[PDB]
Amino acid sequence: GSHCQKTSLRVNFEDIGWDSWIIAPKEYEAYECRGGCFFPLADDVTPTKHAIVQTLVHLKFPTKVSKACCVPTKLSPISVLYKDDMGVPTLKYHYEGMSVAECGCR
Amino acid sequence: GSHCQKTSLRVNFEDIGWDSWIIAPKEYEAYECRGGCFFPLADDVTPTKHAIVQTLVHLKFPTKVSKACCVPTKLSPISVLYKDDMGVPTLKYHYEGMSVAECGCR
Ligand SMILES: [Cl-]
Ligand SMILES: [Cl-]
Ligand SMILES: [Cl-]
Ligand SMILES: [Cl-]
Ligand SMILES: [Cl-]
Ligand SMILES: [Cl-]
Ligand SMILES: [Cl-]
Ligand SMILES: [Cl-]
Ligand SMILES: [Cl-]
Ligand SMILES: [Cl-]
Ligand SMILES: [Cl-]
Ligand SMILES: [Cl-]
Ligand code: NA
Ligand code: NA
Ligand code: NA
Ligand code: NA
Ligand code: NA
Ligand code: NA
């Protein structure tokens, strides 16, 4: 519906220069938040008042003030197999903030 | 330093069609978050891992994946004088989420 939402983003750790310390997995589903912040809103979302006020000021003064932005509002962990100070392969069971759980306009 | 930060944004309630129910004040300091999300980061900020990973994927695939976005990460209340169901002028002492307290890349 052209509104702020979660969509797929497969991240390869080698592509981002993290494969020097992340051994596994090779790739993971990080998701991303894409779409607009405009009126009217999706009826099942959690908007802030600052995002609604800024979006309205944007409409009136579009060259000076930016619209609201679609961003992750909650993140989930993943497990990684990483190399510790000596190099030993070690499991990090809950590696926080790697994957989008919820999107919203902020 | 061209990095994500708090900057002034004076909001007039009439400009955004809220003066029908907000009587006072006329205008308030809402702030906004402006600036880039790029490497290297400001050394005193609170970045998420998803924002760092997405920014790096953006660098590699700039046409497909967007960069991180500079947004409010904490909001503060203001007091408003508002009209209640009958029209009586009523103070809302803590009207949440009207003003930026902190900015960050998300
Ligand atoms: Cl991709
Ligand atoms: Cl996965
Ligand atoms: Cl709406
Ligand atoms: Cl629509
Ligand atoms: Cl809010
Ligand atoms: Cl962690
Ligand atoms: Cl203005
Ligand atoms: Cl003020
Ligand atoms: Cl950095
Ligand atoms: Cl710099
Ligand atoms: Cl994080
Ligand atoms: Cl409130
Ligand atoms: Na990718
Ligand atoms: Na995954
Ligand atoms: Na303008
Ligand atoms: Na304004
Ligand atoms: Na104020
Ligand atoms: Na590309």
Swiss-Prot record, chains A, B:
Chain residue ranges for the region called Interaction with ENG: 79-93
Localization, UniProt: Secreted
Record annotation: effect of changing R10W: In HHT5; impaired protein processing and function
Post-translational modification: A reversible disulfide bond can be formed between the two subunits in the homodimer; this has no effect on GDF2 activity.
Expressed in which tissues: Detected in blood plasma (at protein level).
Disulfide-bond pairs as recorded: C4-C70, C33-C103, C37-C105
Functional description taken from the UniProt entry: Potent circulating inhibitor of angiogenesis. Signals through the type I activin receptor ACVRL1 but not other Alks. Signaling through SMAD1 in endothelial cells requires TGF-beta coreceptor endoglin/ENG.
Clinical disorder: Telangiectasia, hereditary hemorrhagic, 5: A multisystemic vascular dysplasia leading to dilation of permanent blood vessels and arteriovenous malformations of skin, mucosa, and viscera. The disease is characterized by recurrent epistaxis and gastro-intestinal hemorrhage. Visceral involvement includes arteriovenous malformations of the lung, liver, and brain.
Assembly with partners or alone: Homodimer; disulfide-linked. Detected in extracellular fluid as mature homodimer, and in complex with its propeptide. Interacts with ACVRL1, BMPR2 and ACVR2B with high affinity (in vitro). Identified in a complex with ACVRL1 and ACVR2B. Has ten times lower affinity for ACVR2A (in vitro). Interacts with ENG, forming a heterotetramer with a 2:2 stoichiometry. Can form a heteromeric complex with ENG and ACVRL1. Interacts with type I receptor ACVR1.
Similarity annotation: Belongs to the TGF-beta family.
Protein name per its UniProtKB record: Growth/differentiation factor 2
Organism whose genome encodes this protein: Homo sapiens (Human)
Full-protein residues shown: 324 to 429 of 429
